[PDB]
Symmetry: C3
Subunit: 279 residues, 3 copies
Amino acid sequence: KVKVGIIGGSGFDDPNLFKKVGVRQVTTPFGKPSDTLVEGFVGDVACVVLPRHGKGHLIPPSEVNYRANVWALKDLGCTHILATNACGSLQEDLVPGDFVVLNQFMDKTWGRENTFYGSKPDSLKGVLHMPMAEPFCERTRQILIQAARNKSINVYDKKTMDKSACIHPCVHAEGSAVTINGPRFSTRCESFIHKAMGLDIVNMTLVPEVSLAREAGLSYASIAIVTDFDCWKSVLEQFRKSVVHVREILLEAVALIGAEDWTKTIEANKALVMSSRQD
Amino acid sequence: KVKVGIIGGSGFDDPNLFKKVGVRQVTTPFGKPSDTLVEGFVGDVACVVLPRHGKGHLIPPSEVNYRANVWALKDLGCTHILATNACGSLQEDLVPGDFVVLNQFMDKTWGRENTFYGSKPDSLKGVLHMPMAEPFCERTRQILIQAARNKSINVYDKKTMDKSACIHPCVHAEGSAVTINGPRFSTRCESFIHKAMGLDIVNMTLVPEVSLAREAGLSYASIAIVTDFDCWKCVDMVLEQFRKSVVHVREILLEAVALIGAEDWTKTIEANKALVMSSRQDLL
Amino acid sequence: KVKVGIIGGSGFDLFKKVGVRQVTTPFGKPSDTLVEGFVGDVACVVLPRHGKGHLIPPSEVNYRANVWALKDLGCTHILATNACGSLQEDLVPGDFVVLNQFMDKTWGRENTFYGSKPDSLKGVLHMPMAEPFCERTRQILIQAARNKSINVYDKKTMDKSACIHPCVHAEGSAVTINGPRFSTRCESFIHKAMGLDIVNMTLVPEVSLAREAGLSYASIAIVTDFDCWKSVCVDMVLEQFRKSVVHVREILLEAVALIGAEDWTKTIEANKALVMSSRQDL
Ligand SMILES: Nc1ncnc2c1ccn2[C@@H]1O[C@H](CO)[C@@H](O)[C@H]1O
Ligand SMILES: Nc1ncnc2c1ccn2[C@@H]1O[C@H](CO)[C@@H](O)[C@H]1O
Ligand SMILES: Nc1ncnc2c1ccn2[C@@H]1O[C@H](CO)[C@@H](O)[C@H]1O
């Protein structure tokens, strides 16, 4: 019943997380996904891998068909989506090499299809107004964090640990992301403004992927990879080692997801979609 | 003579504000309005009603044809537009059941047609740069407020009265709205950011409706309906509270139309159109 | 050698022209035809942002075509003028700002040369924009003002009481809004509380696209009024502008000469190198 979709960002243009069982060239009512979808098994848990930018990373963040990617995963029977998201750090405690299991975001994107529903032929009929107060699936967030612990990777929770317990590299138990449209990076002026707003990282791909996953009735969680500090503070090796440990986290997270019942969580996801219909 | 247009938001998809005299199924050079326009009278005052989202609430905020809506009302000869706007509160003193006669906004929408003019053939010829310092028609704002007074609804003015005078439910005499694109609600992160900017409410429909009304030379005023606290902070009571708010807003609207028709608006209307002409930057 | 493109904003819709040139671009047609000529020995190209009739609003300007057309003609530098409203007390109508920073609030504009759609160059370009302008070219605009005996105010070293108007502000940040409407008081105060200096509609993505084209770009903002945070309309932007046009013209002509008097070999190399190294599809 549980099937785990994986959307790989930078460093995961072609992951190979398991032996490929089948390759799926699909289309959706909202167009074609970034690439073909690879189906397989992690242990006894069915799993589907999909590169957000395509195999060659030729599709910029603003042009990614988030609808197609999410809906395609949904059509294949995924109940969860795990995503990676490379990012810049807006805080001194978040150091290149750290990961962040996001729990909040601020949206500054535009010109992207951010919803499956509407009044145009491009969309499913209805007006969907989805609650996003806490935009991720909390259970699945805690999976990612527990996965890191299982793989002996440091975890820092600012709510229960003081500064001295922050050993790098570490996974930050929470954090907020600002999603900019791209493709350019932020100016120093924009970086300081975001930092003053209390944001933790800056990224170009989280939104509307996270929003559409909830719309599709899926449990979604992102692991953000701190590649560098954003330009408020004036290499490839740290990122190479990062994807190795992110691979471990993803593989362990899939197993942890399959080790539990999700019947009521899946049911509540579906009901929230139906209850958010305004029409 | 005046003619008052009414753009009904949530809770006003099918208003029935008066006995329908005539219905207009029209189009504009900017496309189709949300729905048929219903014409009639409030007393001796001509009035036109249009649901922003259509009868069945099938049109989401981002896809509403604000241009067509404002232009269709203009074509029928409306001089004023009164709008309802459902919203979430960003401040402690603004509670569900309150109303807000907006005077300010902050815009965070995109991908919406927000001007009638441009250099493209599918827009009116010319470049219009409208001043928007005080984006509403002040006279018409004060009419909404006085209408609330006449209907025995509490009015609260933070600049004059102590917070000890804020008695719920009340019409807030001033307020700023942040307009987000939707269709999703804000995250807690976005809610606290907006609140820290000093914004009072969050809503998805105010802009560019208010902007386009000024571009059309019309007097525009919005009454926001506080349906809930935004996520910075039983549903059966929430629904019942909103229904009561709708009853109150309905009588405010009806009294407002009567108040408008009772006064002379020659100079205000003249100033409305002159403001349009003087913003034509291509006329130098 | 060097060649200077000049993108004129409001009131700039400069020399003895050699010829007028019509050009096309893989991203459409520029705002207008281009004026080719010389300031001294320095080749110079002049392009009005809104067209000769100012019929093109800021959100509909083809910044891609304008910047690329200047590139196609062999420009190494672009000087730009941008009319703006002030968000702070010390910046008054008649002042000028040699911008070093911005905050972007535009939408629906073509802001990159690269992408995966047919009407764009193939590739994913992620350009660093920490310091979005060419610093050398900024300091040239500022030095140009000194040569023409226009006051220069540096808020990093100078007193608020030592601010002599009209002056060129040696640094400043712009918020770029989409237009065509002006800001509300609410928006104006929010921008002010963010620490931004001016508000305008034309800087972005022009500045971004110039760096994509590997050109040294600098902007001089012309303060036409205070934004509505004080006690702004179309007619006001035009009137104040008149006296400011003359000073800006002097600065631009002087700046062109100053550019032509230095070697830009390594700067140009670095510009084109930054373009290549930002390609993340490779
Ligand atoms: N400091 C930043 N600001 C915005 N995006 C960033 C960073 C750092 C990494 N990314 C992500 O990686 C790609 C561009 O480098 C894009 O996919 C982007 O999401
Ligand atoms: N807390 C909020 N944030 C943003 N919009 C809100 C609310 C509450 C109500 N609305 C308005 O009503 C519709 C969404 O329910 C939309 O039409 C919207 O304008
Ligand atoms: N206070 C302001 N806010 C926004 N834009 C302003 C100003 C003042 C000038 N401009 C510039 O003038 C043009 C539109 O009038 C546009 O080119 C615009 O950049």
